[PDB]
Design a protein around this motif. Structure first.
Motif, PDB file in Angstrom:
ATOM      1  N   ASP A  84       0.819  -1.202   0.000  1.00 22.87           N
ATOM      2  CA  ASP A  84       0.000   0.000   0.000  1.00 22.87           C
ATOM      3  C   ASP A  84       0.859   1.261   0.000  1.00 22.87           C
ATOM      4  OD1 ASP A  84       0.969  -0.715   2.385  1.00 22.87           O
ATOM      5  OD2 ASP A  84      -0.849  -0.302   3.547  1.00 22.87           O
ATOM      6  N   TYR A  85       0.200   2.390  -0.250  1.00 24.34           N
ATOM      7  CA  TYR A  85       0.899   3.641  -0.494  1.00 24.34           C
ATOM      8  C   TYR A  85       1.453   4.189   0.818  1.00 24.34           C
ATOM      9  CZ  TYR A  85       1.655   8.265  -2.621  1.00 24.34           C
ATOM     10  OH  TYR A  85       2.190   9.432  -3.077  1.00 24.34           O
ATOM     11  N   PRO A  86       2.727   4.581   0.852  1.00 18.09           N
ATOM     12  CA  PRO A  86       3.399   4.800   2.143  1.00 18.09           C
ATOM     13  C   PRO A  86       2.915   6.004   2.920  1.00 18.09           C
ATOM     14  CG  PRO A  86       4.964   4.243   0.444  1.00 18.09           C
ATOM     15  CD  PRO A  86       3.687   4.498  -0.255  1.00 18.09           C
ATOM     16  N   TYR A  87       2.848   7.166   2.302  1.00 18.77           N
ATOM     17  CA  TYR A  87       2.496   8.395   3.001  1.00 18.77           C
ATOM     18  C   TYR A  87       1.107   8.831   2.557  1.00 18.77           C
ATOM     19  CZ  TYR A  87       5.312   9.680  -1.089  1.00 18.77           C
ATOM     20  OH  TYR A  87       5.881   9.724  -2.333  1.00 18.77           O
ATOM     21  N   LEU A  88       0.094   8.261   3.198  1.00 11.76           N
ATOM     22  CA  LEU A  88      -1.256   8.404   2.670  1.00 11.76           C
ATOM     23  C   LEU A  88      -2.123   9.244   3.594  1.00 11.76           C
ATOM     24  CD1 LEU A  88      -4.355   6.862   2.465  1.00 11.76           C
ATOM     25  CD2 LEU A  88      -3.189   7.739   0.483  1.00 11.76           C
ATOM     26  N   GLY A  89      -1.774   9.310   4.874  1.00 12.67           N
ATOM     27  CA  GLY A  89      -2.485  10.138   5.832  1.00 12.67           C
ATOM     28  C   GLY A  89      -1.530  11.092   6.512  1.00 12.67           C
ATOM     29  N   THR A  90      -0.647  11.680   5.721  1.00  7.05           N
ATOM     30  CA  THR A  90       0.671  12.075   6.172  1.00  7.05           C
ATOM     31  C   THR A  90       0.890  13.543   5.820  1.00  7.05           C
ATOM     32  OG1 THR A  90       1.209   9.790   5.720  1.00  7.05           O
ATOM     33  CG2 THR A  90       3.016  11.220   6.020  1.00  7.05           C
ATOM     34  N   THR A  91       1.881  14.173   6.456  1.00  7.83           N
ATOM     35  CA  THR A  91       2.251  15.536   6.095  1.00  7.83           C
ATOM     36  C   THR A  91       3.125  15.575   4.847  1.00  7.83           C
ATOM     37  OG1 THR A  91       4.211  15.518   7.479  1.00  7.83           O
ATOM     38  CG2 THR A  91       2.154  16.100   8.488  1.00  7.83           C
ATOM     39  N   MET A  92       3.567  14.416   4.356  1.00  3.19           N
ATOM     40  CA  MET A  92       4.442  14.395   3.185  1.00  3.19           C
ATOM     41  C   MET A  92       3.665  13.999   1.929  1.00  3.19           C
ATOM     42  SD  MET A  92       8.172  12.470   2.912  1.00  3.19           S
ATOM     43  CE  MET A  92       8.918  13.435   4.203  1.00  3.19           C
TER      44      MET A  92
END
Ligand SMILES: *[C@@H]1O[C@H](CO)[C@@H](O[C@@H]2O[C@H](CO)[C@@H](O)[C@H](O)[C@H]2NC(C)=O)[C@H](O)[C@H]1NC(C)=O
Ligand SMILES: *[C@@H]1O[C@H](CO)[C@@H](O[C@@H]2O[C@H](CO)[C@@H](O)[C@H](O)[C@H]2NC(C)=O)[C@H](O)[C@H]1NC(C)=O
Ligand SMILES: *[C@@H]1O[C@H](CO)[C@@H](O[C@@H]2O[C@H](CO)[C@@H](O)[C@H](O)[C@H]2NC(C)=O)[C@H](O)[C@H]1NC(C)=O
Ligand SMILES: *[C@@H]1O[C@H](CO)[C@@H](O[C@@H]2O[C@H](CO)[C@@H](O)[C@H](O)[C@H]2NC(C)=O)[C@H](O)[C@H]1NC(C)=O
Ligand SMILES: *[C@@H]1O[C@H](CO)[C@@H](O)[C@H](O)[C@H]1NC(C)=O
Ligand SMILES: *[C@@H]1O[C@H](CO)[C@@H](O)[C@H](O)[C@H]1NC(C)=O
Ligand SMILES: *[C@@H]1O[C@H](CO)[C@@H](O)[C@H](O)[C@H]1NC(C)=O
Ligand SMILES: [Ca+2]
Ligand SMILES: [Ca+2]
Ligand SMILES: [Fe+3]
Ligand SMILES: [Fe+3]
Lengths: 87, 641, 436, 641
Positions: free
Chosen positions: D443-451
């Motif tokens: 799955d996509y790594p930075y998905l709920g993220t500041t990046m």
């Protein structure tokens, strides 16, 4: 014509007087043979000439004028007018 | 040569001038059909007779249905009542009662006795002595038996005895005993909310309305022997005999023993249909009750006789005459209509998926003929305009004038009582219903007794034939008015007076609603939105073609769910089934909100503020939700701004 | 009887109407009445009345506002509809039906519905989004009454409605009898600018009540018209707030109602009404055209809303038409014109009913009722002047004078008639299409 | 003229090779929109921009719908996670987490820390160390956050810390924070069941899902400090890195403090609609989330890009080109999808009485483009055949192949999880819902993220324009294929294989069912009845004319409500809202019946036998009742005789 699913609107209206004083309304009248001996209230069981079913000057004003003298059942209108005029 | 309303009304009257109801009431009272308990053999022969007649009138499909229900009958040991002292050594036997209350718990108890006038919820405060720790007696009438047992059970009593006085029920015989069911609610109780078919494996479940106390019926001379030992005097507001007394003597005591066992019986329902030509899948249901505990001449014979004769007239009038109904018609004969009418309720809960938006009217031909003085109707308000026109076209059988004599009758109408067979349909399923009686000023005295036989009914009502002819004419007027024309005659604007009556009832307690800190005005605006909804729908019936069918189907699908959207969607159907926010039981309906606000002015500490504010939120959004569901689509709202 | 003409019908959505008018307009000139000898439009050798009548002489456009029901009228639609359904009414007037009131834009629906419940059931509510649409909704039959100021009483008077009851303003022990003369229109400017003058109005911002109203549009711009001599007013003033006018104009883009509700003539905007014209006068404008009673009703803590809580009387002074200053306290010696008071209009058949129901409904909920919060007061409102003018005292009876000509008086009918060639309201064009 | 299908997909590709998605995903990542929590000012500016676009594209009607909700936001004081020694003297801190967890509790605690794999219930029952009284740590992924906190609340723990390891989530920046809602269930929890408008006046309530324990998200590099102090090795079956350790040493113990405050904020939903020409009132809803916590280009950027370009495309095809739909289309941008999707659930609970039986498909465009390799779909079974045809038209973006590589794909489809936004349409309302993604295997790594931002997005996917072209092409095939034709492409044949899978799953426990004394046969006959209903309906499509509309409306209404009739009618919609008996939650669903049944074999005492009898009765009668309501009228149900 405007009752659904038709939805049609009048876009160009035509005039009936002269070019100088254009009239938009027009009159509806009831023409009879001379010396035929009817007034408006003896008008029963005599052979009648209409111009259409639902046209303005030929159906709605004649049947609407003499309408409430008809006996029950009024609805459908054509049954009681059909028993009113003798053809 | 099409048929319009005038030819079809005189065609129906030419049919009703010929038929003879009196021979068929005498035929459903022959010695081979007369004692009809639920599930007994004598029910079966009538059931095969009704199915056989429905095949013989050439209906388009006759079909039947059988499923298994638990009732509660008398054990071999005789339940009884007896007077004892504090020790039990003094023994004086009162009587051994023939009649019994179904669903009364089986137990034996002693106690002193307190009177109540009917067991109304108002009575136990107006009563002088405390009720708890003691058996009560009540007087039969004005409410269901289940509300008496539910009220006296709600105030910690132990047993209930039920009797018929001489003032309310004037009968010569002082020996007569009777019957009644005690389930608060409707249907087979041991399957609450799901059908009693043997697809459902019969799981252990027990309804939440069944009582916990032994209930018993006694005769009149059996009541007066208890009135001899009890000392007191009734208030003069209770119109009663001279011999009633309030409470027992102090050394005296009353023990009753109740022994009733469960039985599992087989239930039949017998159906027939007449197909429709424009829309076959939409249909109107006409019902009747087939069994009753005594001989049952006033309670089941008249309803089934009217049902069979309406099958004869409508199937005859479709086949020979040339009538063409645009919608189907279902004739129904329910059995066990007397234990809370379990046939109808198990039939709905069986086939609720197939009846969703299909059925749109029930007509209840039960107890149609009880006297000859008045005409008393009870219906869901979409039928009111319909009943208006029908009351202008039915002559009274005694005097030749019409039945629409009082121009203001919509406010006199009482809501549907729980023992009536139309109440599970309207309150449970959201289908419009109607019942009607030719009720006398006083009710029919020996209704559920063993005295209910034919010749007593012809002596009470001297001309049974013309009265049954008038009730059959009213039912024929309804069935033709709904299923001849392209337009449904369900008048939807009549709900507006009901919403106005509710908000106008809450507008007196606006002064305390302003004290809680929440405004009322959103509910004013909800009533307004339902008015502009029905106004816009009346405009859409204005601007449509009547000959076209594809647009009138789209409008009639929007009228046909104006009743379904008043069923509250926030409560479980298995727990509290009667989900109709106006007309039903529970804590969610509108009288429960008016009550739950009315408690606060007492300042008792009994009202429940969280439950109130919750009730106001759900009732407000239910009314506004039906208003959004009438007016158009999702984008034609006319929302917040 | 008299009937309307035959028409060329067309679709309502796809049209296309401009090609029908473009076609026939170039047709009746070349082919109308002996205009070509080769081809005739209105005669035929092998028949009569083909595609047209042989009595027709010309074609004029049906205005775009007029739909089907307004084309046939109301008497003729009712006669054909009763002739289809088959009712034939007897009609003796003993009890009257509940009056379907009309209300605009979701504040008047709140006050209207609260009045609908506080009555017995005699007053119902049907909405609209402009006042110009609710007048048409009276003409169709989907509503019955309205309370209109005299500029829209002229429009609804042209269209075939009649006034029934006329609002008073002067407090008296007998005001149901007394016919008031009217109220004075003024323009209000400030003490910050002393260079302003009625002779000097070129390039100044002008706040207005709304388009078509008496004191906000008809009376002042009818007086400015005779000086500036041309119909466009968006070029005379630099800016200004007048709602209801066209979205392109500067008159539209000075106002504040956000978003997409700019120039919408109803309580969606803050600047609509008398008091909202006073809001754009205080905030961003130079001159506003209001009644004389506006500054006393928003002066000195009478409004709890803070911008009018801070304000005062003496700084704002109204200007005469010759060019001098006269105080707001003395309004009689300096006014633009005397405009008539507002009026309740309805159709000619429900005149007696709306008269009867509003007379009885007045005494319950009139100005006699104190303790308005916690009760109902029909004439008071939450300072937005909704469903009724807030300083009404009583609905005056109109006897001997129930016609827009007789009620509005001669000076105001002339004063609107000098502006009738400049009017751009489409419903007035559609109502005056009827006249030959 | 007319436009048929093969002309029309060609016209879609000609409209689709012109548009540009890359400029719009730059536009939603400018500095005037980039931090947008729900209710913030940037959300309302984006809603004014979208609500301007739906006006500029000439939609038939554009409307706004706002309501007030309660979310939870950070406090002005920091929340920290801080190591406490046994001495209480020297106190060491690990992180002040920038990211928070919604719907947690404001608290502060100390105690032992115990590692758990993912917080599956299988994990907690596989552990050696006892769980109770001790803060836990879990790894994000494979389960919603709320079910991690739900399981850790059922095993009586105090604290939950959630982090991202490198093996499941390979990134470079170890100091990075993220976000998640912890509410089990969906919707605004402080108003369950009823909508959050301003007519309810906000009564006091609370949902059932809200935990009573502090939750906190920590970075990877924070987890390395905690794993510096712990001991006891992770077992090798956990596919993990080399640093994770099981429990804390006996000296030190952590201290979690979480301080969050409620807030009540305004939610906007923007809509626009394209009308239909044959049946305008039936419609199909297309949605996308409008906001995200960080910069948010993977979560809400690509959804709003695809939505704006699709609204341009279909409005342009109807206006300029000559396409003529038969049913309406609603394009929708709701906010607050990140707090468990309250912007959609409050809409469904708002207008449920109006889109009863009207809305027949929901499509989700959310999280469309994440990976470039695979293609994963999740849908109601009614849509499966539909998706199959679309996978035979669309080409892959990277390679020239089609999507239909695997001809056995109906079993690999996983049911809709609760963090998807299409779940309250299917499970609560009864609308067939479909979602899809081009997703890489991990799955996509930075998905709920500041990046999550466009720079790193275009670093992952080097050709974003072609893939967005492919996803908009697939949604175009769904909308056009659902709307141009007189026959719906909902394939009701597909529930039959589900039913065969269920009864086949119950045959392996026929040995335990036969010991209870109850048989299984009625449930086999229920499966057979649903088979004959679907086969009879297919033949009734065989005999119908296609140009006729009145005989195809009566056959389309039976197709539309084959999804509604699987909703259980025996539960309360406030106590448990998700009532779909296949794909729901509670005790009423069918894998809840299996999960009740398999516990009887182990003989703990956890099985509830009366509950199993009621679940067998209600599941059997729900499936049998849907099989009645799909096949014909009332009289054409064949009974057991
Ligand atoms: C369905 O249910 C009924 C009632 O539970 C069953 O009928 C009972 O069958 C047993 C076994 O033969 C008898 O001892 C009982 O007397 C029957 N009940 C009655 C009221 O007669 C019936 O067998 C079940 N199965 C079927 C296929 O109908
Ligand atoms: C008043 O209403 C409240 C709210 O329903 C009742 O309080 C709780 O209600 C829940 C049902 O949601 C039940 O668990 C209990 O009845 C109550 N739980 C508690 C007190 O922890 C309350 O019982 C109602 N009645 C009174 C007299 O307050
Ligand atoms: C709808 O409900 C909201 C929630 O209370 C109201 O918004 C609040 O109104 C009060 C008083 O006007 C003020 O504190 C703020 O304007 C709002 N508070 C917050 C936290 O946003 C709103 O007024 C209600 N709508 C109507 C028409 O009454
Ligand atoms: C097992 O199922 C039974 C079903 O009767 C549950 O027992 C009662 O269920 C009703 C639900 O209507 C509750 O109101 C009662 O409080 C329950 N009684 C008891 C003693 O629990 C029971 O809860 C279920 N669970 C277990 C573990 O037995
Ligand atoms: C219930 O009855 C007992 C004795 O019969 C009595 O002491 C008690 O007060 C009663 N309860 C109430 C609430 O009065
Ligand atoms: C005002 O109300 C009072 C009380 O309702 C009433 O007696 C009085 O007549 C009213 N005033 C007028 C002018 O009618
Ligand atoms: C719960 O935790 C405490 C921690 O002190 C432990 O001693 C106890 O054994 C645990 N409970 C059970 C049932 O193991
Ligand atoms: Ca049942
Ligand atoms: Ca909610
Ligand atoms: Fe003519
Ligand atoms: Fe005015």
């Amino acid at each position: 014509a405007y009752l659904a699913p038709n939805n049609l609107k009048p876009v160009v209206a035509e005039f009936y007087g002269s070019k100088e004083d254009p009239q938009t309304f027009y009159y509806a009248v009831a023409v009879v043979k001379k010396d035929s001996g009817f007034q408006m209230n003896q008008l029963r069981g005599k052979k009648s000439c209409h111009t259409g079913l639902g046209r303005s000057a030929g159906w709605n004003i004649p049947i609407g004028l003499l309408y409430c003298d008809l006996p029950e059942p009024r609805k459908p209108l054509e049954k009681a007018v059909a028993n009113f005029f003798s053809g | 040569f099409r048929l319009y309303w005038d030819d079809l009304k005189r065609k129906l009257s030419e049919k009703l001038d010929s038929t003879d109801f009196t021979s068929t009431i005498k035929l459903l009272n022959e010695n081979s059909y007369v004692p009809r308990e639920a599930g007994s053999q004598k029910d079966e022969n009538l059931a095969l007779y009704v199915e056989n007649q429905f095949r013989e009138f050439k209906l388009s499909k006759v079909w039947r249905d059988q499923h298994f229900v638990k009732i509660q009958v008398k054990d071999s040991a005789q339940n009884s009542v007896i007077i004892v002292d504090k020790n039990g050594r003094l023994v004086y036997l009162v009587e051994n009662p023939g009649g019994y209350v179904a669903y009364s718990k089986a137990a034996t108890v002693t106690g002193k006795l307190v009177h109540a006038n009917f067991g109304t919820k108002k009575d136990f405060e107006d009563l002088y002595t405390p009720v708890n720790g003691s058996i009560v007696i009540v007087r039969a009438g004005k409410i269901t038996f289940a509300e008496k047992v539910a009220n006296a059970e709600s105030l910690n009593a132990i047993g209930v005895l039920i009797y018929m006085d001489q003032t309310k029920f004037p009968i010569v015989n002082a020996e007569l005993s009777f019957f009644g069911h005690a389930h608060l609610g409707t249907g087979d109780p041991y399957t609450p909310g799901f059908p009693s078919f043997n697809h459902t494996q019969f799981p252990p479940s027990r309804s939440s309305g069944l009582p916990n106390i032994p209930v018993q019926t006694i005769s009149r001379a059996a009541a007066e022997k208890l009135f001899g030992n009890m000392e007191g005097d009734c208030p003069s507001d209770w119109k009663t005999d001279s011999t009633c007394r309030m409470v027992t003597s102090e050394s005296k005591n009353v023990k009753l023993t109740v022994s009733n066992v469960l039985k599992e019986i087989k239930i039949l329902n017998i159906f027939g249909v007449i197909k429709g030509f424009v829309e076959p899948d939409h249909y109107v249901v006409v019902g009747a009750q087939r069994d009753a505990w005594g001989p049952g001449a006033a309670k089941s014979g008249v309803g089934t006789a009217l049902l069979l004769k309406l099958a004869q007239m409508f199937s005859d009038m479709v086949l020979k005459d040339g009538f063409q109904p645009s919608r189907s018609i279902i004739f129904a004969s329910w059995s066990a209509g007397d234990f809370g009418s379990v046939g109808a309720t198990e039939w709905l809960e069986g086939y609720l998926s197939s009846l969703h938006l299909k059925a749109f009217t029930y007509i209840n031909l039960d107890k149609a003929v009880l006297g000859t003085s008045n005409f008393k109707v009870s219906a869901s308000p979409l039928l009111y305009t319909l009943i208006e026109k029908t009351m202008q076209n039915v002559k009274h059988p005694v005097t030749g004038q019409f039945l629409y004599q009082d121009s203001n009758w919509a406010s006199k109408v009482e809501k549907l009582t729980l023992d009536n067979a139309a109440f599970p349909f309207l309150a449970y399923s959201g289908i419009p219903a109607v019942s009607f009686c030719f009720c006398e000023d006083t009710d029919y005295p020996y209704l559920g007794t063993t005295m209910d036989t034919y010749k007593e009914l012809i002596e009470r009502i001297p001309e049974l034939n013309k009265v049954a002819r008038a009730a059959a004419e009213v039912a024929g007027q309804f069935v033709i008015k709904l299923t001849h024309d392209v337009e449904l005659n369900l008048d939807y604007e009549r709900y507006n007076s009901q919403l106005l009556s509710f908000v106008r009832d809450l507008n007196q307690y606006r002064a305390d609603i302003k004290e809680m800190g929440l405004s009322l005005q959103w509910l004013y605006s909800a009533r307004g939105d339902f008015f502009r909804a029905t106004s816009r729908l009346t405009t859409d019936f204005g601007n449509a073609e009547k000959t076209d069918r594809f647009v009138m189907k789209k409008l009639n699908d929007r009228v046909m769910r104006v009743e379904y959207h008043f069923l509250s969607p926030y409560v479980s159907p298995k727990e509290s089934p009667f989900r109709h926010v106006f007309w039903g039981s529970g804590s969610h309906t509108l009288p429960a909100l008016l009550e739950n606000l009315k408690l606060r002015k007492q300042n008792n500490g009994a009202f429940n503020e969280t439950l109130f504010r919750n009730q106001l939120a759900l009732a407000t959004w239910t009314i506004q939700g039906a208003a959004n569901a009438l007016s158009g689509d999702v984008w034609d709202i006319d929302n917040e701004f | 009887a008299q009937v309307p003409s035959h028409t060329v019908v067309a679709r309502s959505m796809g049209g296309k109407e401009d090609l029908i008018w473009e076609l026939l307009n170039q047709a009746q000139e070349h082919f109308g009445k002996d205009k070509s000898k080769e081809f005739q439009l209105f005669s035929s050798p092998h028949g009569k009345d083909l595609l047209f009548k042989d009595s027709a002489h010309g074609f004029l456009k049906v205005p775009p506002r007029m739909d089907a029901k307004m084309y046939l009228g109301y008497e003729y639609v009712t006669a054909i509809r009763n002739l289809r359904e088959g009712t034939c009414p007897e009609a003796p007037t003993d009890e009257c039906k509940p009056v379907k009131w009309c209300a605009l834009s979701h504040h008047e629906r709140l006050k209207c519905d609260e009045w609908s419940v506080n009555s017995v059931g005699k007053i119902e509510c049907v909405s609209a989004e402009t006042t110009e649409d609710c007048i048409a909704k009276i003409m169709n039959g989907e509503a019955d009454a309205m309370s209109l100021d005299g500029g829209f009483v002229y429009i609804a008077g042209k269209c075939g409605l009649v006034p029934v009851l006329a609002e008073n303003y002067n407090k008296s022990d007998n005001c149901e009898d007394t016919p008031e003369a009217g109220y004075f229109a003024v323009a209000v400017v400030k003490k910050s600018a002393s260079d302003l003058t009625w002779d000097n109005l070129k390039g100044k911002k002008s706040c207005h009540t709304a388009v078509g109203r008496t004191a906000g549009w008809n009376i002042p711009m009818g007086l400015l018209y005779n000086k500036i001599n041309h119909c466009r007013f968006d070029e005379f003033f630099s800016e200004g707030c007048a709602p209801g006018s066209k979205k392109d104009s500067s008159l539209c883009k000075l106002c504040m109602g956000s978003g997409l509700n700019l120039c919408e003539p109803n309580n969606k905007e803050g600047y609509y009404g008398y008091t909202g014209a006073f809001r754009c006068l205080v905030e961003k404008g130079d001159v506003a055209f209001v009644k004389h009673q506006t500054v006393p009703q928003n002066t000195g803590g009478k409004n709890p809303d803070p911008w009018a809580k801070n304000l005062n009387e003496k700084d704002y002074e109204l200007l005469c038409l010759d060019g001098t200053r006269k105080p707001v306290e003395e309004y009689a010696n300096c006014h633009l014109a005397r405009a008539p008071n507002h009026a309740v209009v309805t159709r000619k058949d429900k005149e007696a009913c709306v008269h009867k129901i509003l007379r009885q409904q007045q005494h319950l909920f009139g100005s006699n009722v104190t303790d308005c919060s916690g009760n109902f007061c029909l004439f008071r409102s939450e300072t937005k002047d909704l469903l009724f003018r807030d300083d009404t005292v009583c609905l005056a009876k109109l006897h001997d004078r129930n016609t827009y000509e007789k009620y509005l008086g001669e000076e105001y009918v002339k004063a609107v008639g000098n502006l009738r060639k400049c009017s751009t309201s489409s419903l007035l064009e559609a109502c005056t299409f009827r006249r030959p």
